[PDB]
Amino acid sequence: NMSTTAHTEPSWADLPFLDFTDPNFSWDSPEVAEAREKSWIARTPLALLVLRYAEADQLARDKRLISGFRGLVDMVGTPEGPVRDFMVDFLQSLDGADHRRLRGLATHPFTPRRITAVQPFVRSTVEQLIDKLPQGDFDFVQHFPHPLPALVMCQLLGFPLEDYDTVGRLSIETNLGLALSNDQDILVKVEQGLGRMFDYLVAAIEKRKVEPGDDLTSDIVRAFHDGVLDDYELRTLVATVLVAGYETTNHQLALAMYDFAQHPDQWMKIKENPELAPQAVEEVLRWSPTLPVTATRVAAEDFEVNGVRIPTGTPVFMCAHVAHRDPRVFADADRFDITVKREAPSIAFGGGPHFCLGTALARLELTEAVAALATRLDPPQIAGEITWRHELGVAGPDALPLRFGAA
Ligand code: HEM
Ligand SMILES: COc1ccc([C@](O)(c2cncnc2)C2CC2)cc1
Ligand SMILES: [Cl-]
Ligand SMILES: [Cl-]
Ligand SMILES: [Cl-]
C-alpha cells in the first residue's frame, strides 16, 4: 500500500525511509535526526511520518486529513466484532457532526474551572501516595503512577475509589495498541479485554440512570435521558475517556522519574524552587513523550503540502518525539533542561478538533506529582529492570524499579 504509492509519487522519491516497526528502532537514533534534517516528512511502511514541529501542527489540524482509525481498520482487515465496533465508533474515529456532538458531552470536566475544582483531590492523592512509599527499592509504577491516574479516573467517572486497582487493570488489559493487529489470537484477548471492562462500565452506567451524582458518567447519562445519544454511544464514550485517561498518564509519570534519574541536579533545582514544576513537566513532555507518535490521520482527498503530494487513503503520522527536538523551534533540543523557559510548548497532546480531551487534567496530575515528589524526596535512581512496552507508537515502563536517595 505505502510501497505501491511510493512507486507512483515523484514527490516521495527524495523522502528518507524510517522503519519504526523494526524491533531495534530508536527514536533517538542518529538516522532519525538525519531524516528530520533532510526532510520535514519521512516514508515508513505504514504511513508518512512528519518530523518537524511546524508541519506536525499544520497537518494535525488539516481538514483534508481525516482522523485515522477507520482507514487503518479496513487496510489491516479486521473482522466484524466488539474490537472493530469500538475502533470505528469511538471518539478518535469520528469526524464532523458526530464528533462535535459526542466530544461536547465530555468536555465540561476539563474546563479551567473544573481542573481547579479537582486540584485538591489530586494534591491530597499525591500526598497520601508519597506517605506510604516503601523506603528501599520499589516499583514506582505499582506504588505511584498506577494508583494516581486510576484514583483520579475513579473520581472523574464516579467509580468507588476502592476500585482503582480493578479500574486500572481493566484499562490495561483492553490492549488498544494491539487492536490493529493481523493475528487472531491477539485480537481474541483484545476482545475479552474490552468485554470485561464493559462489564464494569455497564453496571456503573445503569447505576447512574437511577442515582446520578456530580461525576462525568452522570452527566453523559443526563444526555441519554435527553436523547442526545443512545446506550451504545454512552458506554463507548465512557470507555474512551477511561482507557485514554489512565495508561498514558501512568507511563508519563514513570518517564518523568526515568528522566530525573539521569539528571539528579535538575531534580534538586525543583526542590529549591518548586515553582519550576510546570516548566519541568513540559520538558518531560518534550524530551520523553509517552506517545512519540501523537496525531494519526488519513488523507480523505488528493492534496499537496510543502512540495509533497498526499493521495487519498495515505496515513500520515505526526512524530511529536522527533518534532520536539526540532532546532528550528527548540534551543539545544537534544539536551534535557528544565531551566529553559521555552516559547513553544510540547505537542504531546496532538492538535486540531481531536486534540487530547484530558490535556489539562494530564498536566495537573503531572505537575502535582513532580512538585511534591521533588520537594519531599531525594533524586530517583534506577533499581532494576525497566520493562519497556515493546509496542508500536507507545513509550512507557510497565514496571519502574527505583529508590529515592542513595542511603
Ligand atoms: C500525559 C498523558 C496524555 C497524553 C500524552 C495524551 C495524548 C493524547 C494524544 C496525542 C491524543 C490524540 C490527539 C490527536 O489525534 O490529535 C489524545 C487523545 C485523547 N485523549 Fe489523551 N493524552 C494524555 C492523557 C489523557 C487523559 C488524562 C485523558 C482523560 C482524562 C485523555 C483523554 C483523551 C481522549 C478522550 C482523546 C480523544 C480525543 C478525540 O478524538 O476527540 N488523555 N491524547
Ligand atoms: C499512538 O497514537 C495514539 C494511539 C492511541 C491514542 C488514544 O486515543 C489515547 C489517548 N489519550 C491517551 N492515551 C491514549 C488511545 C485511547 C485510544 C492516541 C494516540
Ligand atoms: Cl533538523
Ligand atoms: Cl529544508
Ligand atoms: Cl527553547
Short mmCIF file of C-alpha atoms and ligand atoms in Angstrom, two decimals:
data_model
loop_
_atom_site.label_atom_id
_atom_site.label_comp_id
_atom_site.label_asym_id
_atom_site.label_seq_id
_atom_site.Cartn_x
_atom_site.Cartn_y
_atom_site.Cartn_z
CA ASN A 1 0.00 0.00 0.00
CA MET A 2 2.65 2.53 1.09
CA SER A 3 5.09 0.76 -1.26
CA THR A 4 2.73 0.96 -4.26
CA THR A 5 2.00 4.64 -3.54
CA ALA A 6 5.75 5.35 -3.27
CA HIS A 7 6.32 3.86 -6.74
CA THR A 8 3.70 6.27 -8.16
CA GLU A 9 4.70 9.53 -6.43
CA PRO A 10 7.70 11.57 -7.71
CA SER A 11 7.42 13.88 -4.67
CA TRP A 12 8.10 10.83 -2.45
CA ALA A 13 11.38 9.99 -4.25
CA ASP A 14 13.72 12.04 -2.02
CA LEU A 15 11.93 11.26 1.26
CA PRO A 16 14.13 9.45 3.82
CA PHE A 17 12.94 5.99 4.88
CA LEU A 18 12.38 5.19 8.55
CA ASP A 19 11.29 1.69 9.61
CA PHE A 20 9.83 2.23 13.09
CA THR A 21 8.17 -1.21 13.05
CA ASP A 22 11.67 -2.73 13.31
CA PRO A 23 12.46 -4.32 16.74
CA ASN A 24 15.79 -2.43 17.05
CA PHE A 25 14.43 1.00 16.07
CA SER A 26 15.11 4.03 18.26
CA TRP A 27 13.53 7.50 18.07
CA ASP A 28 16.83 8.87 19.42
CA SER A 29 18.78 7.20 16.60
CA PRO A 30 21.09 9.45 14.52
CA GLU A 31 19.24 8.06 11.48
CA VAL A 32 16.05 9.76 12.69
CA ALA A 33 17.76 13.10 13.35
CA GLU A 34 19.32 12.97 9.87
CA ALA A 35 15.88 12.33 8.35
CA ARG A 36 14.46 15.44 10.04
CA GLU A 37 17.47 17.46 8.81
CA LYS A 38 16.94 16.17 5.26
CA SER A 39 13.13 16.39 5.16
CA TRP A 40 10.05 17.61 7.05
CA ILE A 41 8.40 14.26 6.32
CA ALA A 42 9.60 10.64 6.03
CA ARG A 43 8.42 7.38 4.46
CA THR A 44 7.54 4.46 6.76
CA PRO A 45 5.97 1.04 5.98
CA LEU A 46 2.65 2.16 7.50
CA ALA A 47 2.49 5.93 6.96
CA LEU A 48 4.14 9.18 6.02
CA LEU A 49 5.83 10.44 9.18
CA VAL A 50 6.01 14.18 9.87
CA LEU A 51 9.30 15.01 11.57
CA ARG A 52 9.24 18.79 12.02
CA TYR A 53 7.39 20.87 14.62
CA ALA A 54 5.64 23.40 12.34
CA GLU A 55 4.27 20.82 9.88
CA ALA A 56 3.32 18.43 12.70
CA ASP A 57 0.94 21.10 14.00
CA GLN A 58 -0.18 22.10 10.49
CA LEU A 59 -1.18 18.60 9.40
CA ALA A 60 -2.74 17.71 12.78
CA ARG A 61 -5.26 20.48 12.05
CA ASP A 62 -5.66 19.98 8.28
CA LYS A 63 -9.30 19.22 7.38
CA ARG A 64 -8.17 17.15 4.37
CA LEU A 65 -6.62 14.71 6.85
CA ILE A 66 -9.40 12.68 8.48
CA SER A 67 -8.87 11.20 11.95
CA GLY A 68 -7.10 7.92 11.18
CA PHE A 69 -8.50 4.75 12.71
CA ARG A 70 -11.32 3.90 10.25
CA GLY A 71 -8.74 3.78 7.43
CA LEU A 72 -6.27 1.61 9.36
CA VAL A 73 -9.02 -0.91 10.21
CA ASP A 74 -10.04 -1.55 6.57
CA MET A 75 -6.44 -1.89 5.34
CA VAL A 76 -5.43 -4.38 8.06
CA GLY A 77 -8.67 -6.34 7.52
CA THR A 78 -10.23 -6.51 10.99
CA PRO A 79 -13.29 -8.82 11.11
CA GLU A 80 -16.68 -7.65 12.42
CA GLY A 81 -16.92 -7.80 16.22
CA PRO A 82 -16.54 -5.91 19.55
CA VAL A 83 -12.99 -4.80 18.62
CA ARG A 84 -13.90 -3.30 15.22
CA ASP A 85 -17.10 -1.73 16.60
CA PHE A 86 -15.08 0.15 19.23
CA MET A 87 -12.30 1.08 16.78
CA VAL A 88 -14.72 2.66 14.27
CA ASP A 89 -17.24 4.27 16.66
CA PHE A 90 -15.06 5.64 19.49
CA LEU A 91 -14.27 9.36 19.67
CA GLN A 92 -10.90 9.30 17.85
CA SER A 93 -12.54 7.59 14.83
CA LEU A 94 -15.36 10.11 14.34
CA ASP A 95 -15.40 13.40 12.43
CA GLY A 96 -17.80 16.23 11.55
CA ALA A 97 -21.17 16.46 13.30
CA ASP A 98 -20.99 13.23 15.34
CA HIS A 99 -17.57 14.12 16.76
CA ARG A 100 -18.60 17.60 17.98
CA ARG A 101 -21.77 16.07 19.43
CA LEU A 102 -20.08 13.27 21.41
CA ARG A 103 -16.94 15.22 22.42
CA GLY A 104 -19.02 18.18 23.67
CA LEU A 105 -20.72 15.91 26.22
CA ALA A 106 -17.39 15.07 27.89
CA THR A 107 -15.66 18.49 27.73
CA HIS A 108 -17.09 20.12 30.89
CA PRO A 109 -14.84 18.49 33.48
CA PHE A 110 -11.72 19.67 31.60
CA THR A 111 -12.53 23.41 31.66
CA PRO A 112 -10.15 25.67 33.69
CA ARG A 113 -12.79 25.93 36.44
CA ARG A 114 -13.26 22.16 36.83
CA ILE A 115 -9.50 21.50 36.80
CA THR A 116 -9.18 23.96 39.70
CA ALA A 117 -12.10 22.17 41.42
CA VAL A 118 -10.50 18.71 41.13
CA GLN A 119 -7.00 20.01 42.04
CA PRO A 120 -7.35 19.45 45.84
CA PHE A 121 -8.19 15.76 45.28
CA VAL A 122 -5.12 15.41 43.03
CA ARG A 123 -2.85 17.15 45.56
CA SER A 124 -4.04 15.07 48.54
CA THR A 125 -3.90 11.84 46.50
CA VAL A 126 -0.27 12.61 45.58
CA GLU A 127 0.43 13.50 49.24
CA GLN A 128 -1.04 10.21 50.54
CA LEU A 129 0.81 8.04 47.98
CA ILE A 130 4.15 9.63 48.94
CA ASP A 131 3.39 9.00 52.65
CA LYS A 132 3.07 5.24 52.04
CA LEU A 133 6.02 4.79 49.67
CA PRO A 134 8.48 2.00 50.59
CA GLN A 135 11.86 3.08 51.98
CA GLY A 136 14.03 0.90 49.73
CA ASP A 137 13.92 -0.32 46.14
CA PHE A 138 10.36 -0.42 44.81
CA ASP A 139 8.34 -0.41 41.61
CA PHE A 140 7.42 3.23 41.03
CA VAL A 141 4.54 2.11 38.77
CA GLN A 142 2.82 -0.11 41.38
CA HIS A 143 3.17 2.48 44.17
CA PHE A 144 2.51 5.81 42.36
CA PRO A 145 1.79 6.23 38.60
CA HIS A 146 -0.66 3.34 38.60
CA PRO A 147 -2.73 4.46 41.63
CA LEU A 148 -2.64 8.23 40.92
CA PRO A 149 -4.32 8.35 37.47
CA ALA A 150 -6.52 5.37 38.42
CA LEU A 151 -7.82 7.16 41.53
CA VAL A 152 -8.31 10.40 39.58
CA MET A 153 -10.15 8.35 36.93
CA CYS A 154 -12.42 6.81 39.59
CA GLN A 155 -13.08 10.31 40.96
CA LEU A 156 -13.84 11.66 37.47
CA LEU A 157 -16.07 8.83 36.23
CA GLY A 158 -17.79 8.32 39.60
CA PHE A 159 -16.47 4.85 40.39
CA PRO A 160 -15.75 3.92 44.03
CA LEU A 161 -12.17 4.98 44.86
CA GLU A 162 -11.51 1.50 46.31
CA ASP A 163 -11.79 0.09 42.76
CA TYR A 164 -8.67 1.93 41.47
CA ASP A 165 -6.76 -1.38 41.21
CA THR A 166 -9.59 -3.06 39.27
CA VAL A 167 -10.24 0.00 37.06
CA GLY A 168 -6.54 0.42 36.17
CA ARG A 169 -6.26 -3.31 35.47
CA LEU A 170 -9.36 -3.21 33.25
CA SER A 171 -7.87 -0.31 31.26
CA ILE A 172 -4.50 -2.02 30.60
CA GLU A 173 -5.97 -5.40 29.61
CA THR A 174 -8.05 -3.90 26.78
CA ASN A 175 -4.82 -3.55 24.74
CA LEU A 176 -5.89 -0.98 22.13
CA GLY A 177 -2.32 -0.84 20.79
CA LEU A 178 -2.79 -4.43 19.60
CA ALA A 179 -6.31 -3.89 18.20
CA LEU A 180 -4.96 -3.16 14.71
CA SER A 181 -3.09 -6.50 14.73
CA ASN A 182 -3.41 -9.03 11.91
CA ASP A 183 -3.24 -12.08 14.22
CA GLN A 184 -6.45 -13.68 15.52
CA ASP A 185 -5.08 -14.94 18.88
CA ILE A 186 -4.04 -11.36 19.70
CA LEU A 187 -7.43 -9.97 18.62
CA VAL A 188 -9.19 -12.51 20.88
CA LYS A 189 -7.54 -11.24 24.10
CA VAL A 190 -8.34 -7.67 23.00
CA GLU A 191 -11.99 -8.71 22.55
CA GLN A 192 -12.05 -10.29 26.03
CA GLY A 193 -10.20 -7.30 27.50
CA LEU A 194 -12.87 -4.90 26.22
CA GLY A 195 -15.73 -7.17 27.35
CA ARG A 196 -14.51 -7.32 30.95
CA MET A 197 -14.11 -3.52 31.11
CA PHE A 198 -17.55 -3.04 29.53
CA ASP A 199 -18.94 -5.41 32.20
CA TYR A 200 -17.76 -2.92 34.83
CA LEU A 201 -18.93 0.12 32.83
CA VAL A 202 -22.48 -1.09 32.06
CA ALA A 203 -23.02 -1.73 35.79
CA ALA A 204 -21.85 1.81 36.62
CA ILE A 205 -23.93 3.44 33.85
CA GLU A 206 -27.26 1.82 34.84
CA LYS A 207 -26.44 2.80 38.43
CA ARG A 208 -26.21 6.43 37.25
CA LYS A 209 -29.53 6.18 35.37
CA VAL A 210 -31.32 5.92 38.74
CA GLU A 211 -29.00 7.80 41.13
CA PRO A 212 -26.73 10.36 39.40
CA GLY A 213 -24.03 12.46 41.11
CA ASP A 214 -21.57 15.20 40.12
CA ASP A 215 -19.40 12.81 38.08
CA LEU A 216 -18.86 12.62 34.29
CA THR A 217 -20.83 9.36 33.87
CA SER A 218 -23.86 11.07 35.48
CA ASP A 219 -23.60 13.98 33.01
CA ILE A 220 -23.47 11.73 29.92
CA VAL A 221 -26.46 9.85 31.39
CA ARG A 222 -28.36 13.18 31.50
CA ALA A 223 -27.75 13.48 27.75
CA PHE A 224 -29.08 9.93 27.27
CA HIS A 225 -32.25 10.98 29.14
CA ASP A 226 -32.43 13.99 26.78
CA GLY A 227 -31.97 11.70 23.75
CA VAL A 228 -28.63 13.20 22.67
CA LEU A 229 -27.03 9.73 22.45
CA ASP A 230 -28.16 6.09 22.71
CA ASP A 231 -26.95 3.41 25.15
CA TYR A 232 -24.28 2.10 22.75
CA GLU A 233 -22.80 5.59 22.31
CA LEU A 234 -22.95 6.11 26.09
CA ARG A 235 -20.77 3.15 27.10
CA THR A 236 -18.41 3.76 24.16
CA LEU A 237 -17.82 7.39 25.23
CA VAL A 238 -17.24 6.45 28.89
CA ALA A 239 -14.86 3.69 27.74
CA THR A 240 -12.87 6.09 25.56
CA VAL A 241 -12.37 8.57 28.43
CA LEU A 242 -11.30 5.76 30.81
CA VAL A 243 -8.84 3.90 28.54
CA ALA A 244 -7.22 7.13 27.31
CA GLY A 245 -7.14 8.66 30.80
CA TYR A 246 -5.14 6.00 32.65
CA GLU A 247 -2.35 4.17 30.80
CA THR A 248 -0.53 7.11 29.20
CA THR A 249 -0.65 9.28 32.35
CA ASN A 250 0.78 6.24 34.16
CA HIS A 251 3.64 5.88 31.66
CA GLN A 252 4.32 9.63 31.51
CA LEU A 253 4.83 9.78 35.29
CA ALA A 254 7.25 6.84 35.04
CA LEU A 255 9.10 8.55 32.18
CA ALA A 256 9.34 11.67 34.38
CA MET A 257 11.27 9.71 37.03
CA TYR A 258 13.45 7.98 34.44
CA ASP A 259 14.42 11.43 33.10
CA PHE A 260 15.38 12.77 36.54
CA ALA A 261 17.25 9.54 37.34
CA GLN A 262 19.64 10.72 34.61
CA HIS A 263 19.54 14.36 35.77
CA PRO A 264 19.52 14.46 39.62
CA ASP A 265 20.96 18.00 39.57
CA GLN A 266 17.75 19.24 37.91
CA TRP A 267 15.61 17.38 40.45
CA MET A 268 17.41 19.34 43.20
CA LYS A 269 16.62 22.58 41.34
CA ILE A 270 12.89 21.81 41.63
CA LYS A 271 13.48 21.06 45.33
CA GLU A 272 14.95 24.56 45.72
CA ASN A 273 12.27 26.26 43.60
CA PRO A 274 9.04 24.14 43.47
CA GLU A 275 7.57 26.72 41.04
CA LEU A 276 9.73 25.11 38.33
CA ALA A 277 7.42 22.05 38.27
CA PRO A 278 5.17 23.12 35.33
CA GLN A 279 8.24 24.03 33.25
CA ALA A 280 9.85 20.72 34.26
CA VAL A 281 6.72 18.78 33.26
CA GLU A 282 6.76 20.49 29.86
CA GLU A 283 10.40 19.46 29.41
CA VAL A 284 9.47 15.87 30.34
CA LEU A 285 6.67 16.02 27.74
CA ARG A 286 9.11 17.45 25.17
CA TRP A 287 12.05 15.14 25.93
CA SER A 288 10.16 11.91 26.55
CA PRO A 289 6.51 11.96 25.40
CA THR A 290 4.64 8.74 26.27
CA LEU A 291 3.20 8.84 22.74
CA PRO A 292 6.14 9.56 20.37
CA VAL A 293 3.52 9.40 17.63
CA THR A 294 0.65 11.68 18.60
CA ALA A 295 -1.87 12.53 15.88
CA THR A 296 -2.69 9.81 13.36
CA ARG A 297 -4.54 10.83 10.20
CA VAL A 298 -5.66 9.53 6.79
CA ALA A 299 -5.97 11.69 3.67
CA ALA A 300 -9.62 11.96 2.59
CA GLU A 301 -8.60 13.54 -0.74
CA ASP A 302 -5.63 14.15 -3.05
CA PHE A 303 -3.75 17.25 -1.90
CA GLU A 304 -0.28 18.80 -1.69
CA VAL A 305 1.65 20.24 1.27
CA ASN A 306 5.24 21.58 1.28
CA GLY A 307 6.08 20.03 -2.11
CA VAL A 308 4.69 16.58 -1.26
CA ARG A 309 1.62 15.03 -2.89
CA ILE A 310 -0.53 13.06 -0.44
CA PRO A 311 -3.01 10.76 -2.25
CA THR A 312 -6.39 9.68 -0.82
CA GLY A 313 -6.08 6.93 1.79
CA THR A 314 -2.48 7.75 2.74
CA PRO A 315 -1.91 7.51 6.50
CA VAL A 316 0.01 10.44 7.99
CA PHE A 317 1.51 10.21 11.49
CA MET A 318 2.77 13.20 13.47
CA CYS A 319 6.03 12.29 15.18
CA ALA A 320 5.98 14.52 18.27
CA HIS A 321 9.13 12.93 19.75
CA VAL A 322 11.22 13.99 16.73
CA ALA A 323 9.35 17.30 16.34
CA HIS A 324 10.25 18.02 19.98
CA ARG A 325 13.95 18.04 19.03
CA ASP A 326 13.50 20.35 16.02
CA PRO A 327 16.27 23.01 16.20
CA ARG A 328 14.01 25.42 14.26
CA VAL A 329 11.92 25.65 17.43
CA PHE A 330 13.93 24.44 20.45
CA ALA A 331 17.33 25.66 21.64
CA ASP A 332 19.82 22.88 22.47
CA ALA A 333 17.00 20.50 21.57
CA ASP A 334 18.93 17.28 22.26
CA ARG A 335 19.51 18.16 25.92
CA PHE A 336 17.11 17.63 28.82
CA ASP A 337 16.99 21.00 30.56
CA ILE A 338 14.12 22.13 32.78
CA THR A 339 15.67 25.57 33.43
CA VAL A 340 14.95 26.81 29.89
CA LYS A 341 11.76 28.87 29.59
CA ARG A 342 10.62 27.71 26.15
CA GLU A 343 8.38 29.76 23.84
CA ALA A 344 6.85 26.72 22.16
CA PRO A 345 5.08 24.03 24.20
CA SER A 346 5.41 20.31 23.67
CA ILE A 347 2.90 18.91 21.19
CA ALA A 348 2.45 15.75 23.28
CA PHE A 349 -1.35 16.09 23.14
CA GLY A 350 -1.79 16.38 19.37
CA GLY A 351 -3.81 19.16 17.76
CA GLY A 352 -6.97 20.00 15.82
CA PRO A 353 -10.53 19.18 16.98
CA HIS A 354 -9.29 15.75 18.13
CA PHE A 355 -6.62 17.16 20.49
CA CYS A 356 -6.33 15.31 23.81
CA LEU A 357 -9.53 15.89 25.79
CA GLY A 358 -7.66 15.34 29.07
CA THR A 359 -4.79 17.73 28.25
CA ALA A 360 -5.35 20.00 31.28
CA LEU A 361 -6.02 17.13 33.71
CA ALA A 362 -2.93 15.25 32.47
CA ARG A 363 -0.78 18.35 33.08
CA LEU A 364 -2.39 18.82 36.51
CA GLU A 365 -1.57 15.24 37.60
CA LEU A 366 1.99 15.55 36.25
CA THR A 367 2.64 18.95 37.89
CA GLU A 368 1.22 17.98 41.30
CA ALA A 369 3.27 14.76 41.23
CA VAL A 370 6.61 16.28 40.14
CA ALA A 371 6.27 19.24 42.55
CA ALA A 372 5.52 17.07 45.60
CA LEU A 373 7.99 14.27 44.80
CA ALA A 374 10.87 16.69 44.17
CA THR A 375 10.06 18.71 47.31
CA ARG A 376 9.82 15.70 49.64
CA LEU A 377 12.22 13.10 48.21
CA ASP A 378 15.86 12.73 47.16
CA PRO A 379 16.59 12.31 43.42
CA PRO A 380 15.44 8.96 41.99
CA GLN A 381 17.86 6.28 40.80
CA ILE A 382 17.02 3.10 38.86
CA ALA A 383 16.97 -0.10 40.93
CA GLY A 384 16.47 -2.93 38.41
CA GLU A 385 14.99 -3.94 35.06
CA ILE A 386 12.73 -1.36 33.44
CA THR A 387 10.12 -3.34 31.49
CA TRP A 388 9.52 -1.08 28.47
CA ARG A 389 6.40 -1.79 26.43
CA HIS A 390 7.68 -3.13 23.11
CA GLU A 391 4.57 -1.66 21.47
CA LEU A 392 4.49 0.45 18.30
CA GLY A 393 3.81 4.14 18.94
CA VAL A 394 3.85 3.96 22.75
CA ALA A 395 6.66 4.71 25.22
CA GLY A 396 6.43 3.74 28.88
CA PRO A 397 7.59 1.28 31.56
CA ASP A 398 5.23 -1.47 32.71
CA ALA A 399 7.41 -1.54 35.83
CA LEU A 400 9.93 1.05 37.03
CA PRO A 401 12.07 -0.16 39.96
CA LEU A 402 13.81 2.70 41.75
CA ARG A 403 14.83 4.29 45.04
CA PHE A 404 14.67 7.89 46.23
CA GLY A 405 18.13 8.61 47.62
CA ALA A 406 21.29 6.50 47.78
CA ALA A 407 21.24 5.69 51.52
C1 HEM B 1 0.14 12.89 29.65
C2 HEM B 1 -0.72 11.94 29.28
C3 HEM B 1 -1.52 12.03 27.95
C4 HEM B 1 -1.01 12.15 26.72
C5 HEM B 1 0.49 12.23 26.33
C6 HEM B 1 -2.11 12.20 25.78
C7 HEM B 1 -2.02 12.32 24.41
C8 HEM B 1 -3.07 12.27 23.51
C9 HEM B 1 -2.96 12.40 22.07
C10 HEM B 1 -1.65 12.62 21.31
C11 HEM B 1 -4.19 12.30 21.55
C12 HEM B 1 -4.54 12.38 20.04
C13 HEM B 1 -4.79 13.82 19.63
C14 HEM B 1 -4.96 13.93 18.13
O1 HEM B 1 -5.47 12.97 17.49
O2 HEM B 1 -4.58 14.99 17.57
C15 HEM B 1 -5.13 12.10 22.63
C16 HEM B 1 -6.49 11.95 22.52
C17 HEM B 1 -7.41 11.79 23.54
N1 HEM B 1 -7.13 11.81 24.90
FE1 HEM B 1 -5.19 11.93 25.69
N2 HEM B 1 -3.28 12.10 26.50
C18 HEM B 1 -2.96 12.00 27.84
C19 HEM B 1 -3.87 11.89 28.88
C20 HEM B 1 -5.25 11.86 28.78
C21 HEM B 1 -6.20 11.95 29.88
C22 HEM B 1 -5.82 12.12 31.37
C23 HEM B 1 -7.44 11.87 29.36
C24 HEM B 1 -8.82 11.91 30.08
C25 HEM B 1 -8.97 12.28 31.35
C26 HEM B 1 -7.31 11.72 27.92
C27 HEM B 1 -8.35 11.60 27.04
C28 HEM B 1 -8.28 11.63 25.66
C29 HEM B 1 -9.41 11.48 24.77
C30 HEM B 1 -10.89 11.26 25.16
C31 HEM B 1 -8.83 11.59 23.36
C32 HEM B 1 -9.60 11.51 22.03
C33 HEM B 1 -9.94 12.94 21.64
C34 HEM B 1 -10.78 13.00 20.39
O3 HEM B 1 -10.51 12.24 19.43
O4 HEM B 1 -11.72 13.82 20.36
N3 HEM B 1 -5.97 11.72 27.61
N4 HEM B 1 -4.41 12.09 23.81
C1 LIG B 2 -0.14 6.31 19.01
O1 LIG B 2 -1.30 7.04 18.59
C2 LIG B 2 -2.31 7.02 19.52
C3 LIG B 2 -2.83 5.81 19.98
C4 LIG B 2 -3.86 5.80 20.93
C5 LIG B 2 -4.37 7.01 21.42
C6 LIG B 2 -5.52 7.02 22.46
O2 LIG B 2 -6.60 7.79 21.92
C7 LIG B 2 -5.03 7.72 23.74
C8 LIG B 2 -5.48 9.00 24.06
N1 LIG B 2 -5.06 9.59 25.16
C9 LIG B 2 -4.20 8.98 25.97
N2 LIG B 2 -3.75 7.76 25.70
C10 LIG B 2 -4.13 7.11 24.62
C11 LIG B 2 -6.00 5.60 22.82
C12 LIG B 2 -7.34 5.51 23.57
C13 LIG B 2 -7.26 5.10 22.09
C14 LIG B 2 -3.85 8.21 20.95
C15 LIG B 2 -2.83 8.22 20.00
CL CL B 3 16.56 19.25 11.74
CL CL B 4 14.65 22.04 4.05
CL CL B 5 13.51 26.85 23.54
#
